[PDB]
Amino acid sequence: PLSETKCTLKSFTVEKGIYQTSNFRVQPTESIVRFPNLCPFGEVFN
């Protein structure tokens, strides 16, 4: 995370202070698919 800021200033000298390096994101673990009549196969087949 230190090397990525020096690429923002393009300089090998980094002046005393705070610099904003590229943002980070939390990434997703997994996908969650969720779906909630009935067809009368108990009324047709039985």
Partner: protein, 115 residues
């Protein structure tokens, strides 16, 4: 949606050190020495109680400076140096002597004319 924020690399000049203290802004500290802040998740600078004048502003009055060997620290920004003026209804304080200071003041006037 999952938290996110600007990484901020807090450093003294690369002159004095190669050591950086990263500030993850506006995240609780999990998703990453670790110190939770009001501004965000600050990694790599040991907390300090005794508060000094601000050095490198961060946020919410947290100012980081390099010195103690040494390691980047972070602390609640102290505002000036406290004074309590000794005061009473008959008490006056008259200066007996003076100094003459010359203070540079710098202003832009024009900018490069481009067409």
């Amino acid at each position: 949606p999952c938290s996110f924020g600007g990484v901020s690399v807090i450093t003294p000049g690369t002159n004095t050190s190669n050591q950086v203290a990263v500030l993850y802004q506006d995240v609780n500290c999990t998703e990453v020495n670790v110190f939770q802040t009001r501004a965000g998740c600050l990694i790599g600078a040991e907390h300090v109680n005794n508060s000094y004048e601000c050095d490198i502003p961060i946020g919410a009055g947290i100012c980081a400076s390099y010195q103690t060997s040494q390691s980047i620290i972070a602390y609640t920004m102290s505002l000036g140096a406290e004074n309590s003026v000794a005061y009473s209804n008959n008490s006056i304080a008259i200066p007996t002597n003076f100094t003459i200071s010359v203070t540079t003041e710098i202003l832009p006037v024009s900018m490069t004319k481009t067409s």
